[PDB]
Design a protein around this ligand. Structure first.
Ligand SMILES: *[C@@H]1O[C@H](CO)[C@@H](O)[C@H](O)[C@H]1NC(C)=O
Lengths: 49, 49, 27
């Protein structure tokens, strides 16, 4: 998925906010890796929605 | 405080010690008695019985 | 530097008293 930078720290077990709560949520008993990179070079245009 | 039980901090203390070493001065809360000598007795010397 | 060939350097591998025995140990 594509998220805002302030939300990257929210993609983790046990976290709450406007994401990982009534949004994509990981299990607490989670095995795996969350891999992320800055996509601004593709998404720098003023797309809005 | 909002995380589930598996993600809360736990304080861990590990007490490591070898038991078959000849000298030891670390502990022993039992009371000593008179050493009888020259007579069949049940003895306990620094944990060795 | 110079080199030497010694047969010295044994140490007590344990903390107990033994006498009049030949004890085989590994360390
Ligand atoms: C070999 O060992 C003997 C006895 O320690 C010593 O006298 C002799 O010089 C040694 N040789 C060499 C080349 O170290």
């Amino acid at each position: 998925f594509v998220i805002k930078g302030n939300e990257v720290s929210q993609i983790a077990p046990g976290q709450t906010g406007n994401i990982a709560d009534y949004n994509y949520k990981l299990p607490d008993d989670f095995t795996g890796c969350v891999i992320a990179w800055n996509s601004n070079k593709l998404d720098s245009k003023h797309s809005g929605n | 405080p909002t995380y589930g039980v598996g993600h809360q901090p736990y304080r861990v203390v590990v007490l490591s010690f070898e038991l078959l070493h000849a000298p030891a001065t670390v502990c022993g809360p039992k009371k000593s008695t008179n050493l009888v000598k020259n007579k069949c007795v049940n003895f306990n010397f620094n944990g060795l019985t | 530097q110079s080199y030497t060939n010694f047969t010295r350097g044994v140490y007590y591998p344990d903390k107990v008293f033994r006498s009049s025995v030949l004890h085989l140990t590994q360390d």
